[PDB]
Amino acid sequence: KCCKGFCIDILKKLSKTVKFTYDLYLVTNGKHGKKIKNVWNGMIGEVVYKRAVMAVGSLTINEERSVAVDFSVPFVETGISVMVSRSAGTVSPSAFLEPFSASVWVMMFVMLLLVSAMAVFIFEYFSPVHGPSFTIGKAVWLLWGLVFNNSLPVQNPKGTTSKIIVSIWAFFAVIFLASYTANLAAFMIQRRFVDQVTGLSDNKFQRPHDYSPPFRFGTVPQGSTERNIRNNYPDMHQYMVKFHQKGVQDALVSLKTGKLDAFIYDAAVLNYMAGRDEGCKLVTIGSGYIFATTGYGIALQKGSRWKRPIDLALLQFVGDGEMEELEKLWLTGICHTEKNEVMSSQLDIDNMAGVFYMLAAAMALSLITFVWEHLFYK
Amino acid sequence: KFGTQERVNNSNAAAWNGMMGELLSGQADMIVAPLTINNERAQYIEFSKPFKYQGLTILVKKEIPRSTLDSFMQPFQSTLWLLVGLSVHVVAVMLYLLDRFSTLSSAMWFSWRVLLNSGLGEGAPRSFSARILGMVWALFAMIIVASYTANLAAFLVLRRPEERITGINDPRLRNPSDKFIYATVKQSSVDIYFRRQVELSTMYRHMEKHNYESAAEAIQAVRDNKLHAFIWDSAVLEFEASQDCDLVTTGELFFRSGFGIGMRKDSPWKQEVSLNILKSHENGFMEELDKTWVRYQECDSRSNAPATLTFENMAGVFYLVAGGIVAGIFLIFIEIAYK
Amino acid sequence: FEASQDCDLVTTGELFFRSGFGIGMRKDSPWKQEVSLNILKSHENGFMEELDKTWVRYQECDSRSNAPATLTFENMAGVFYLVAGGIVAGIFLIFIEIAYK
Amino acid sequence: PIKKVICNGPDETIPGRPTVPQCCYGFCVDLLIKLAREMDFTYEVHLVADGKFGTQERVNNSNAAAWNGMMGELLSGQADMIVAPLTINNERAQYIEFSKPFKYQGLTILVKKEIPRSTLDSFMQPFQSTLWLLVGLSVHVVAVMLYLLDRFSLTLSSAMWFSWRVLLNSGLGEGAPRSFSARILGMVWALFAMIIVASYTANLAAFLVLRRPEERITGINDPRLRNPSDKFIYATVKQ
Amino acid sequence: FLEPFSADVWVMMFVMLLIVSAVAVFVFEYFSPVFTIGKAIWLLWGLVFNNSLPVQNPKGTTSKIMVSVWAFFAVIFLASYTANLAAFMIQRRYVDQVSGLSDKKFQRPNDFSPAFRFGTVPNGSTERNIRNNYLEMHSYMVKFNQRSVQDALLSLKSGKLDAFIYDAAVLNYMAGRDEGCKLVTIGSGKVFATTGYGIAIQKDSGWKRQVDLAILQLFGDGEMEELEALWLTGICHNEKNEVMSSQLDIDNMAGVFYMLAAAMALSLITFIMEHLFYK
Numbered sequence A: 001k002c003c004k005g006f007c008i009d010i011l012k013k014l015s016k017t018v019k020f021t022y023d024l025y026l027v028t029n030g031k032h033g034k035k036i037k038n039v040w041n042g043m044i045g046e047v048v049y050k051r052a053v054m055a056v057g058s059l060t061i062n063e064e065r066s067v068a069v070d071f072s073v074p075f076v077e078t079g080i081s082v083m084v085s086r087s088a089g090t091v092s093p094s095a096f097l098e099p100f101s102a103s104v105w106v107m108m109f110v111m112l113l114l115v116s117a118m119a120v121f122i123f124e125y126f127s128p129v130h131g132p133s134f135t136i137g138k139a140v141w142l143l144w145g146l147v148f149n150n151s152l153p154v155q156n157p158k159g160t161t162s163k164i165i166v167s168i169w170a171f172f173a174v175i176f177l178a179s180y181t182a183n184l185a186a187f188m189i190q191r192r193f194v195d196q197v198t199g200l201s202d203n204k205f206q207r208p209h210d211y212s213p214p215f216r217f218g219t220v221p222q223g224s225t226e227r228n229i230r231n232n233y234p235d236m237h238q239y240m241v242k243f244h245q246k247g248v249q250d251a252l253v254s255l256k257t258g259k260l261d262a263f264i265y266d267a268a269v270l271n272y273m274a275g276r277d278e279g280c281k282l283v284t285i286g287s288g289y290i291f292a293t294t295g296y297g298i299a300l301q302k303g304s305r306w307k308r309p310i311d312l313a314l315l316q317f318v319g320d321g322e323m324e325e326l327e328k329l330w331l332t333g334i335c336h337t338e339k340n341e342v343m344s345s346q347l348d349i350d351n352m353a354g355v356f357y358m359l360a361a362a363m364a365l366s367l368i369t370f371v372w373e374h375l376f377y378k
Numbered sequence B: 001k002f003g004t005q006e007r008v009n010n011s012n013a014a015a016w017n018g019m020m021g022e023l024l025s026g027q028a029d030m031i032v033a034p035l036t037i038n039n040e041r042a043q044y045i046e047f048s049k050p051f052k053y054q055g056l057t058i059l060v061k062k063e064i065p066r067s068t069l070d071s072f073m074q075p076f077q078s079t080l081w082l083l084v085g086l087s088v089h090v091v092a093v094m095l096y097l098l099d100r101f102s103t104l105s106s107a108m109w110f111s112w113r114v115l116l117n118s119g120l121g122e123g124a125p126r127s128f129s130a131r132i133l134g135m136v137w138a139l140f141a142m143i144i145v146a147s148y149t150a151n152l153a154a155f156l157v158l159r160r161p162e163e164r165i166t167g168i169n170d171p172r173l174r175n176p177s178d179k180f181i182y183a184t185v186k187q188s189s190v191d192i193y194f195r196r197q198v199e200l201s202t203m204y205r206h207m208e209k210h211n212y213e214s215a216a217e218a219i220q221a222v223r224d225n226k227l228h229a230f231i232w233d234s235a236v237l238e239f240e241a242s243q244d245c246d247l248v249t250t251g252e253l254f255f256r257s258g259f260g261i262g263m264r265k266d267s268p269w270k271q272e273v274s275l276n277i278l279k280s281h282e283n284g285f286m287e288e289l290d291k292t293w294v295r296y297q298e299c300d301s302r303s304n305a306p307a308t309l310t311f312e313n314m315a316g317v318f319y320l321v322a323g324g325i326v327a328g329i330f331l332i333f334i335e336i337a338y339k
Numbered sequence C: 001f002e003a004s005q006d007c008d009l010v011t012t013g014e015l016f017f018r019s020g021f022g023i024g025m026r027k028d029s030p031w032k033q034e035v036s037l038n039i040l041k042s043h044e045n046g047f048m049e050e051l052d053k054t055w056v057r058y059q060e061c062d063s064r065s066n067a068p069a070t071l072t073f074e075n076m077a078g079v080f081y082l083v084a085g086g087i088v089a090g091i092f093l094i095f096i097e098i099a100y101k
Numbered sequence D: 001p002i003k004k005v006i007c008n009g010p011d012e013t014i015p016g017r018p019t020v021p022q023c024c025y026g027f028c029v030d031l032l033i034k035l036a037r038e039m040d041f042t043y044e045v046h047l048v049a050d051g052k053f054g055t056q057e058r059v060n061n062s063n064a065a066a067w068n069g070m071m072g073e074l075l076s077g078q079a080d081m082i083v084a085p086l087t088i089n090n091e092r093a094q095y096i097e098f099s100k101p102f103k104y105q106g107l108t109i110l111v112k113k114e115i116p117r118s119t120l121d122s123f124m125q126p127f128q129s130t131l132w133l134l135v136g137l138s139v140h141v142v143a144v145m146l147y148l149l150d151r152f153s154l155t156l157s158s159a160m161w162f163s164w165r166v167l168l169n170s171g172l173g174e175g176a177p178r179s180f181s182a183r184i185l186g187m188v189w190a191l192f193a194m195i196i197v198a199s200y201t202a203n204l205a206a207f208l209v210l211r212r213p214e215e216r217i218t219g220i221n222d223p224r225l226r227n228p229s230d231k232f233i234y235a236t237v238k239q
Numbered sequence E: 001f002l003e004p005f006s007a008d009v010w011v012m013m014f015v016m017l018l019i020v021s022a023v024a025v026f027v028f029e030y031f032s033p034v035f036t037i038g039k040a041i042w043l044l045w046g047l048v049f050n051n052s053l054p055v056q057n058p059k060g061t062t063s064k065i066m067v068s069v070w071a072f073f074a075v076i077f078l079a080s081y082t083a084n085l086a087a088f089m090i091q092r093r094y095v096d097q098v099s100g101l102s103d104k105k106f107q108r109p110n111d112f113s114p115a116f117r118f119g120t121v122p123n124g125s126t127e128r129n130i131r132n133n134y135l136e137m138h139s140y141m142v143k144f145n146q147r148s149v150q151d152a153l154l155s156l157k158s159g160k161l162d163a164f165i166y167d168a169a170v171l172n173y174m175a176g177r178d179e180g181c182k183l184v185t186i187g188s189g190k191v192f193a194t195t196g197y198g199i200a201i202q203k204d205s206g207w208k209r210q211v212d213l214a215i216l217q218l219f220g221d222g223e224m225e226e227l228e229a230l231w232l233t234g235i236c237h238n239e240k241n242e243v244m245s246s247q248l249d250i251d252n253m254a255g256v257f258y259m260l261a262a263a264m265a266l267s268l269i270t271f272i273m274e275h276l277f278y279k
């Protein structure tokens, strides 16, 4: 059976670097070491039994492995992590253009004040000395309609000055709408669609039972983390045990099918999974900080130290450009995550609801004005 | 194939054969064809100064979708777009409430106008306060339209690209699979690159298992979609890329080479030929010919056009008009009915 | 960290020469075995995250405030100034026009 | 409470004053406190002589060791442990013992903040103002043209309002065309006015483009690494 | 908006009016015992393009409503039209002016009334080649010849010269390694007189074939790509460059403005024609 990968390539580097011939085989009992009762299992067993001198792989580092054996390299950055296919949505329609609000909203109120002066010029023209006096109120309602995308039957103002003043306002309204849509145009960018989950501290993970919706997080059996989970939340570990999967593709498919809500694993591998997704529907948590910090470690007989000697060769290797070549060779991942952007055919119904809440508030306000008339003062 | 030096059956040692071996053999004294120029061949025979400098690219690409039903859909799917329209109608009830303690058809029509800027005539309710909602509902209606337009532009964002073009440095190409049914022409010079490049051994075989006797079949496989990707030198490929545009070339030409006539060694003319083709470059002849044939072919770039797709909803509208006026005879019956 | 505290400074995107931090001791130190086990425990426990999060999290830089209005809207102020100025001339001029006809 | 420790300090910014008592705290100090409590040991902290992390210097007079800055101090035996953001590397590992990494980091580049962009009124000058001046003038001529025939067989103001109705999109509707020929004229000109405003909606569209490509500098791909530009100075920390 | 403007939209708009016109006359006449004119045409016009139309509204129930629906859909199309033009605004090939040199504009500066300018370094293979094939270009360009590539660059960069001509590798590296990305390779930088660097030997007696072998060994090894990235690397990678919010020196809309003027003239003489109908 042939073997591939950057570790394999490192081993090639090591054939030359430490000048040592090697025999390579595959483990049978337990994969990455598993400790049950009196005797440990996995490659670590073959390291303890003297069958294996050094154990190599994606193996994570832990204190217990440390009492028993050692690794002086820490070549890669890996941590527990979750891949969630989620999205980011607009909030408050760019706060109804809140930026305009600091200066723009007040000026709109100020704009109404300009209108009163215009009406004052206009009233004299209208009556040197039926009931057009309703026009000023109508004009404000009327002026306001012309402000937003027309669509006001309103009333026809006659006073000569109003037409010019209206034109000055109309011009403004038009360019307002231009800026409005530019604000809207800018938002298209703001329709950032990045995955929306938190880190390890998130309540969806910490207190899963409370949420009405059914979701579950899980990890692979006999992993180093199981213990971390049991040393973080025992209950969470039990939940993970209930929904256990075994192969990467099990999790993958489950995630693609939605059988699995999200998935935690060594981030390094998960990053690689993003490095190899078909369709790009999976991402890391937030930035991708795993929240568990560790690097791959290689086993050595506790008595054995070629690692101290081995260490020297390894660093320069860190310094050398090839690690990055190996990265580019094997770790290159498709669909680099440029702040992701996307367009929705479902638009936004909750943002729409936000809009509708403002709308509803206005409805309440009109009910209040009804009440004022309902209880109009004598 | 032009041919490559290969194991001769049991003997295992043999001449490149094909076009070249015939040349060594003397069947053809001189070889005129599109032949890339390489050292492995070069020791055996003299080559003229390269005529062209073509580089290998991967000639493939498939259709890129543009939803016909996507733009309006932003409303359709949201479903608060229709419902709120009805609530615009409901605002009429609130207005009646405003009327109390200070026509339905006109109201509904008025509500329809704000979505559509109807400007019918009567205007706002007598109560000034009631009329405030008109400003609000039209406000939001306006906002919605504009917002839609912005989301219409969100569709325009497009910018969803396969982005699998960089094969030499591309992650997908390097780690081949059944999703990477990849080939070349059986016995093609790139095979030497895969051969010599032990780094590409994986790919060498991955490639080999899918190879073709010729370009017509190799281009066809991608066109037939039998094979997802095709690898060949650009000069043959780009012209085809222009020819269909259903297929595309991607990445950066690798392993550049000059084109030079292949002839048996010691040809007392190759030098003159080299001078002659040199002149062809000098006088612009070579250049004139390359434009003359390649120039004829051209395809569109990444420029967006509407293409009369989304217009059908309006076709639907016109169909609805017909339904409308049919209903209209019953609407006028109503006036007649109140006869 | 500096770029997160001083918004007038920014980092180039590429990260190169990946490397990492450690406690340093002489090779024959009797605390070497103990010092790492402790580091590992702190990483797994979350102690390391508390320290990084506690100190690092204090400061962040964002693109908050979008683009609409703000600085772009300042010239709009000029536009607003332009509406008010025009109406006054028309008053007397319009009155004169009315007097004329 | 922010835990602090008294750390002997070296030379201050002011002349001399090499000997001082100072206050130390932060990520590494909290780590030291944890390690000390965990392994049960007492300590005294001081800031490294000559202010450096540590690099060997080959030939200043006789051949020299990796005694530079903070690292050498350790070699002397003055410092029994280094607790700082000390990078683990091959060069140093050959002489001292590093614990498993307490932090994974990579080199990057720090540069000044990027320049900003102009306001909308300023933006208007590139396209909106010239067109507004030229076109506004054009509307009056068009209004005059219809009347010509009408005149032959405040009207001007009304015509302007009708033509302006399109621009502001106010659609005041103060006046209507006098004749069927004018309507054909209106049919002509009205359509043109609609096109003109739709082109203004193209101008509306043009506002969004102000997106800026800006720039970023590659570690190896960029020209600056390729040459330390004389005009473009870059550097790092000594030793 | 050109495809939509081309066929289906206008005919459909006529039909809606026409359906309404039939219904309006019959229905309106139905509504009032005691008409579709130009006003109806304006209505197709009012509903269809962002309002701004003050002439009229039909007095009937079925058609008016149907059109409000039309208008709403039409608005969507209008919005899309804006987006379509926005698509144009999204990116633009700010490379339009190209001197192919097979065009003959370069062949003569004098054909173009303002004086054009291009030059190259003398004592070059380029200059000798030029003199061999194209005399006039040489005899004209002698005035525009420059001392050195840095100085030739000074003539291009600070103004006082439009175009510069030189070796393609140097010009490509220069494009990459440049203070300003405004300078860009001609077209695709696809060069006429396609050539490469040449290595001298004495005569027929020399290293010959063994030496060439080494060269194509380099291509196989792949060292040249690395050396290209290191020494030949270029700034501002040549993606399709774009421009935004550019001075709006319309040219096609200018044409549209002319269409307007012409259409007017037609209607004016149409009125004259009509008038004559009488006599």
Ligand SMILES: *[C@@H]1O[C@H](CO)[C@@H](O[C@@H]2O[C@H](CO)[C@@H](O)[C@H](O)[C@H]2NC(C)=O)[C@H](O)[C@H]1NC(C)=O
Residues within 6 Å of the ligand: E122, E123
């Ligand atoms: C190319 O360079 C050569 C050598 O520099 C030039 O030859 C000189 O031309 C100058 C003209 O002022 C004479 O004064 C010298 O006697 C020539 N010989 C030298 C200086 O070595 C030549 O002119 C250049 N090509 C041109 C512009 O014709």
Ligand SMILES: C[C@]12N[C@H](Cc3ccccc31)c1ccccc12
Residues within 6 Å of the ligand: A149, A174, A176, A177, A178, A180, A181, B145, B146, B149, D169, D201, D204, E050, E075, E078, E079, E082
């Ligand atoms: C005129 C206008 N009325 C609506 C929305 C809007 C928003 C901002 C500016 C202008 C417009 C519209 C749709 C399509 C083109 C132009 C517009």
Ligand SMILES: N[C@@H](CCC(=O)O)C(=O)O
Residues within 6 Å of the ligand: A032, A058, A059, A060, A219, A222, A223, A224, A225, A226, A266
């Ligand atoms: N990464 C370790 C353990 C998994 C875990 O951390 O849960 C392994 O490969 O087995």
